[PDB]
Amino acid sequence: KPAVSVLTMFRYAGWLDRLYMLVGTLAAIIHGVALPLMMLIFGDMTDSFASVGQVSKQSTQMSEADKRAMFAKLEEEMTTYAYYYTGIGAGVLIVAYIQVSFWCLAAGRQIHKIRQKFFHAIMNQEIGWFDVHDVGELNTRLTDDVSKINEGIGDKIGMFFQAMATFFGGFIIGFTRGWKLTLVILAISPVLGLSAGIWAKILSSFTDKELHAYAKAGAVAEEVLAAIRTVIAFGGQKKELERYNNNLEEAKRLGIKKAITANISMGAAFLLIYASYALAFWYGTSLVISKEYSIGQVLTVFFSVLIGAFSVGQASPNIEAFANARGAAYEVFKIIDNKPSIDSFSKSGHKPDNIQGNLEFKNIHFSYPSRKEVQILKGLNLKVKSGQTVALVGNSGCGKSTTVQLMQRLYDPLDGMVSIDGQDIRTINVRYLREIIGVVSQEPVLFATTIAENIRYGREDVTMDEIEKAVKEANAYDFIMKLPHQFDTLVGERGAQLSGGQKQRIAIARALVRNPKILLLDEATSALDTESEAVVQAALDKAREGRTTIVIAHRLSTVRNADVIAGFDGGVIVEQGNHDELMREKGIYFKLVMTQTPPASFWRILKLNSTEWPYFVVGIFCAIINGGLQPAFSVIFSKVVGVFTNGGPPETQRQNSNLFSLLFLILGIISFITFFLQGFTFGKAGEILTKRLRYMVFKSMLRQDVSWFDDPKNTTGALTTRLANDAAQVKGATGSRLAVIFQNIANLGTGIIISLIYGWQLTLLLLAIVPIIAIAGVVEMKMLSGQALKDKKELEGSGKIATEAIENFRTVVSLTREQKFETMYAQSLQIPYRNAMKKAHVFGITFSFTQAMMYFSYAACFRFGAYLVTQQLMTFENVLLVFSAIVFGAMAVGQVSSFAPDYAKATVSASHIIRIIEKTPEIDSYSTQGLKPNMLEGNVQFSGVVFNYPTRPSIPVLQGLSLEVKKGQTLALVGSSGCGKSTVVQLLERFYDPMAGSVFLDGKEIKQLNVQWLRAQLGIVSQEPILFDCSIAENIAYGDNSRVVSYEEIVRAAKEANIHQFIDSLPDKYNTRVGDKGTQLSGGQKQRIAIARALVRQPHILLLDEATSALDTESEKVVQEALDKAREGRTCIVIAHRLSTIQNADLIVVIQNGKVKEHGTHQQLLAQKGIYFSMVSVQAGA
């Protein structure tokens, strides 16, 4: 919404840039003007053939006589027109180069300047300005917005003016050569504007419906694939597929409905558009029979106007290009034009010599940019004498840290003054002030360059001698020399990551080359390892003694030797003095002392699509007819102008034109009828295989075993996404693109034959010319993408050293050396500039070439069409025919190149989808194999089990685990931590087979047992029960599948679980809808429901996995009261973390390191003393 003055935007264009734009825009208008002229001549060529076309047939007496006057007229005329044509082509060749080159030149020249100025502006902002802003956004704002600006002031303007030139130029010629047809042509404009308006309403409204339509299915898929382990446990994999299939079934119906309507729309629209012209032209005929117009003039106006008419449309994008570029320039120039109070690029203010370094802080009230919300310094008084070293101590607020902030004048204070020597800080030059102050900060930063270079950021003029003394005076010499490459090493976020204590010591060296008279050390020892801390501390102590210093840390080791110590409470300076005095004060300081002590041929996807042998042949046959039908319109048009040009005696013409125009409208209706067909057939044929594919994928997906679903690669979202995209994308490829690709090859084919047989060698020529301009049209785009990628690569290097400068900014400014990064940025940019210059010459040449190639190619159409061909008996009516036929047949091939990516994007999306079906699991629930034992009573043996999770085969969970539990008794399971407790239940559900060892139930190894039948006997109840959205009766009935469960049966289970209070309490009762769509309830009820479905199954085995995990107060007491009633009739395993409620358990088992450690009945483990005793003691105590 905000935008910029048109004149400010160009403020960096002067002298030449203004001229370039003037010559370019000029040439741009000449260029535009060229096309409607070219069409004007196409009238005069017509009148020439038309005068001879009328007189030639008017004879029917003399022959040789017509070999004289006619041919002479054609000779002089055609040569004239051809000469002019060759003229225009040269014209466009020149202006088209001038157009793009100059504008791109201006663009480059300015954007270079914009970029430099912009970065300079970023570095000039004071810190309070950064504190309030997001640096990341600002950098992305550096690289993206300047690009928008460049796009707008680029050759797009030239294009705009070329377009307006064709539009004006079109409608002028439109009006002068006649006022009638133009008005008649504008008259039909609203209709075309109106039909394409139905499209923006249909598309936008229906696009949501499908996104709404599948949103119902992909919801199923989301609550399923999220709940997977549950549906896997309860084996609802047949139902959860059935549901998805039932929503898919609707989606396809809506999908076919859309297919019907959208094609009706497209067809009807097209028919309106073509009827609309055909009337303008037939109206154009009605005025020729009246001898009001010439048959060539009808052309001249009818072309010029439609050209100019569409030229409006072709300009519209460049308007947007420019506008966006204005709006993009607003926030950029706002930084450039913003001026700081502080600067630091300013040359102003005193520069004292012989600074003795006497500092004082007077009544300083300050607040950081968070402003009125907080005031962190309320008053203040502090002096520090020259050569002394003062220490600042405090509990919190780090108002300590603020004084170091004010002393570099990063912020100016609200009220009060900071005084270096006698003078107010604000009277001294900012840069020089920063140059007389050294700084060592808590988190040290090193820019990416050599150590010498980072030290060279202390001062730009320095020699390895001074570097050496500096690092040796920081005692950083010894440790870096050992490092390879010596001072030439690397540092940064990338490469050569070092000890912090070494980084700080390079930082102290950097600070030391500064030879500052004032030192600020903030926390520099804090957040550092104890051993190296002393190493650095020594350097700090050696860094002072030449200087006056203020230091802030939480280390009261370094403070003692400070000449003065200062405490803060609430921004108010409170205690000051030598250490001893402060202790004698027994105040804040003392208190703190005591406290701290693969693209490939995939046919099989089409083989799946072969489920329909028909609906393809229908569409294809139907589309090829449509292909053959298109050029016939050109044939008509050719003979409408043809017979009319070839007329001879005028009486017969008027009756014929009617016949033709009638036929054409019979063809348009036959075209509509074929088009809707080729649309609908493919559409339905797409929508059904969409179902088949999504079905088979979703089916194969429920086949895989928990091992797969654990993968970081596959998460619920990524799968729904993979599920939608891949299925849409293959529909696309077998969809419209193919129908069209066949319609068009048919269109060129049926055109090329007609043309070829009519014109001998006329066509053969056009087929030499067209492919070359096409290819030449492609190579340009290749070069374009090439240059684009290259420049992207090059400005990226610069933006990288920008990112460094502005992300680490508060440090660079502390060191000054902003001019450094300015210069570096500048040098970096210099390559894309010299590049951007070449870009213009290239862009220009390619464009001009592809225009010229078209105009000269036009000259060849007629010069050969006349002369050699029309000096022969071969005729004009045909030359027109072949012009249109071939030239359109080609432009229909233009659609091939456009649908090219739709195929690739589809095959890649097929690539995964054919694999996701074919992948098979280790444990497949689908295998009907497995024993299905007849004997009821459950036992469970875990023997010698070693298990590692497939995702994390590093730290093992189970190593040599062994358990046994008899029927009808509870096995309590305790652990130090982890899924060691929980993995048991997973393995009994056979989510996994163990690596080594084995687990039996009835004495049969489950590994050889039927996977499904196994899980069918299991009473799984987990931490967070996931309930699908549906009647709670169904969430319960989920407990048993392969059969519909009785109402009284799901009642009994809700009676069991103690959930009945709710289920009767509700208005709907058992038909109420749950899952946070229809209704919401707390976890206790959800759980009791999960308990209900657990024992609807009438399992022989409950599995209670930390069932009380999320729960509170009486809710626990009631759920536990349900679980406790659920077991004791069954084999049970309870890993519950309430050991108070495990006290009554037939066996308790303590898991340690995946081995069982302790086991026995409660009092039996209580009789011992060890892990379980410690477990029951700790949380009974706490």
Ligand SMILES: Brc1ccc(Oc2c(Br)cc(Br)cc2Br)c(Br)c1
């Ligand atoms: Br009759 C008659 C036939 C084609 C005409 O222009 C074309 C041409 Br030429 C080609 C196609 Br495809 C569609 C139309 Br509409 C006109 Br104007 C009148």
